[PDB]
Ligand binder design. Structure first.
Ligand SMILES: CC(C)CN(C[C@@H](O)[C@H](Cc1ccccc1)NC(=O)O[C@H]1CO[C@H]2OCC[C@H]21)S(=O)(=O)c1ccc(N)cc1
Ligand SMILES: [Cl-]
Ligand SMILES: [Cl-]
Ligand SMILES: [Cl-]
Ligand code: NA
Lengths: 103, 99
């Protein structure tokens, strides 16, 4: 419905992100504490982490202080990389771009 | 009205005569609640998240109260680690995501 993708949540709230100079599709996800992206190379050091969701847990690599643009908004923060079914923008970066849930 | 996302967006819901805590989740297509009984008919469904699929019972035309707002829709019931209010019902309480 109302445009990015979409504001009233009748369609998935999908946006384009840019990370490591590549464009990807991601979901704005208020139910995600953390941002999680499919396998890709990121600079710097990382640390393993397991995170859980509906189905159980997956091991991810945690990269801190990564520059990522989200729907045109610049953010710099933690990105988890692993076998997620969807690229997810979680609250750690939603707060950086000033996203709010209103109702 | 406006929920910041510095913490998890948790609300109280009333469903099937009980009160529960649930997460307002724009990343969820569907509402999924921990095991409970609901009246009427249901059919089995599989739903996938991070870390694979779980089997749930799909109940249609269930009335819920979310933070005070009544709504009706499908509710999936099964071994989810968190009660999640998905877009199918967020739309019914006029939730929007703004930035
Ligand atoms: C992965 C998404 C595309 C979909 N998920 C909703 C999502 O909001 C879950 C919702 C969620 C929340 C807690 C536990 C399980 C699932 N969040 C999630 O997995 O976040 C993980 C990354 O950050 C961490 O903080 C939250 C858990 C971790 S889902 O729970 O798997 C899901 C799938 C299908 C339906 N119909 C409803 C929900
Ligand atoms: Cl976008
Ligand atoms: Cl962060
Ligand atoms: Cl529905
Ligand atoms: Na029913």
């Amino acid at each position: 419905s109302f445009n990015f993708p979409q504001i009233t949540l009748w369609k998935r709230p999908l946006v384009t992100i840019k990370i490591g100079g590549q464009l990807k599709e991601a979901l704005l996800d208020t139910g995600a504490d953390d941002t999680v992206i499919e396998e890709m190379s990121l600079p710097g050091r990382w640390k393993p982490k397991m995170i859980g969701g509906i189905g159980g847990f997956i091991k991810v690599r945690q990269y801190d202080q990564i520059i990522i643009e989200i729907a045109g908004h610049k953010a710099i923060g933690t990105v988890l990389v692993g076998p997620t079914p969807v690229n997810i923008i979680g609250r750690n970066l939603l707060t950086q771009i000033g996203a709010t849930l209103n109702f």
